[PDB]
Design a protein around this nucleic acid. Structure first.
Ligand code: MG
Ligand code: MG
Length: 294
DNA sequence: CGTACACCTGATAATGGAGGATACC
DNA sequence: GGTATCCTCCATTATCAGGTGTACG
């Protein structure tokens, strides 16, 4: 029982829009063109993959991916055009994932009129694929030297469309951190810190910036090493006053919801000042130990 | 004593594929 | 045949995530 804007928020965090162009001499052009919508998570979130499937009309399938991950995927061109496109055309992505989605859609529209089974459409598809995710492989790059990449979508400053979007997004790219930090001055030897965090690539700077006014707190840290921003809340009265109540009403999805509850329990012990006693520190240690376990 | 932001860093849950088998027309 | 989808498998990595230092009241 997922809400539409939560699903969009989650796919803004974790979805993959893929176009594969595979060599095969049984096709008249020599290539097979396939579009895939894919969501891949640890098995701990297998129940959220099942909800997603049910949400998307029972379509697609859920399969072992890696050692301990499972993917939900839709690989039918037809089913993609019928269910996925009208969903995201109505409830639009707001990160740079939107750019990949829009180029993915164009490929699908070209597959819909069968233009992919022609030389000219295949070339267009290769140009579209060229600006999606990591771009052309060495194989396609060499087989398609003429194909100029299609300009990436310039979509400007997108607002958070609905608070449920933020719930979904934080479900994928948010962290509810409990830290126990050695302290020379705290009477129990340790500081208990709750940190709320959202991690994104720097190109979505405007979005990340808008979280501060949206949530009425936080600040953006930039990783000194690369293009990575961490929207961060460390002020405990903001945690209590703004973050916890937001997510109480707009609930996180997946097993991360259990983690948020645990984190909430730490805050309670902290609101009571019991984190500054050995017993309270130990409760927090137990809650924390329990986090991220399914 | 205690909090809060400034600053640091790495293991791995996702990123984003791959190719062979089977079904459809 | 030609075309479409299903299924199984995975190499590498961009983050999440798990910190520590220190100024300030
Ligand atoms: Mg993400
Ligand atoms: Mg994520």
């Amino acid at each position: 029982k997922l809400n539409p804007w939560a699903v969009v928020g989650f796919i803004d965090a974790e979805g993959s829009f893929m176009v594969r162009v595979r060599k095969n001499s049984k096709y008249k052009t020599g290539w097979l063109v396939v579009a895939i919508f894919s969501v891949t998570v640890d098995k701990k979130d297998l129940f959220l993959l099942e909800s997603l499937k049910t949400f998307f009309g029972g379509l697609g399938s859920i399969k072992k991916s890696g050692n301990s991950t499972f993917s939900y995927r839709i690989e039918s061109s037809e089913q993609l055009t019928k269910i996925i496109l009208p969903f995201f055309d109505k409830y639009s992505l707001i990160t740079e994932a939107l750019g990949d989605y829009l180029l993915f859609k164009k490929v699908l529209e070209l597959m819909g009129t069968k233009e992919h089974l022609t030389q000219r459409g295949l070339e267009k598809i290769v140009s579209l694929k060229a600006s999606i995710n990591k771009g052309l492989s060495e194989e396609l790059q060499a087989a398609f030297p003429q194909c100029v990449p299609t300009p990436r979508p310039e979509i400007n400053n997108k607002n958070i469309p609905d608070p449920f979007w933020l719930a979904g997004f934080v479900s994928g790219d948010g962290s509810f951190k409990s830290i126990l930090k050695k302290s020379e001055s705290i009477k129990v030897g340790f500081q208990s810190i709750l940190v709320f965090q959202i991690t994104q690539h720097a190109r979505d700077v405007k979005l990340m910036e808008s979280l501060i006014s949206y949530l009425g707190c936080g600040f953006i840290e930039k990783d000194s090493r690369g293009p990575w921003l961490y929207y961060t809340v460390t002020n405990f009265s903001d945690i209590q006053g703004k973050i916890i109540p937001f997510f109480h009403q707009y609930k996180i999805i997946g097993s991360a919801y259990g983690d948020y509850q645990d984190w909430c329990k730490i805050a309670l012990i902290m609101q009571n000042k019991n984190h500054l006693t050995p017993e309270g520190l130990n409760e927090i240690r137990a809650l924390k130990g329990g986090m991220n376990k399914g």
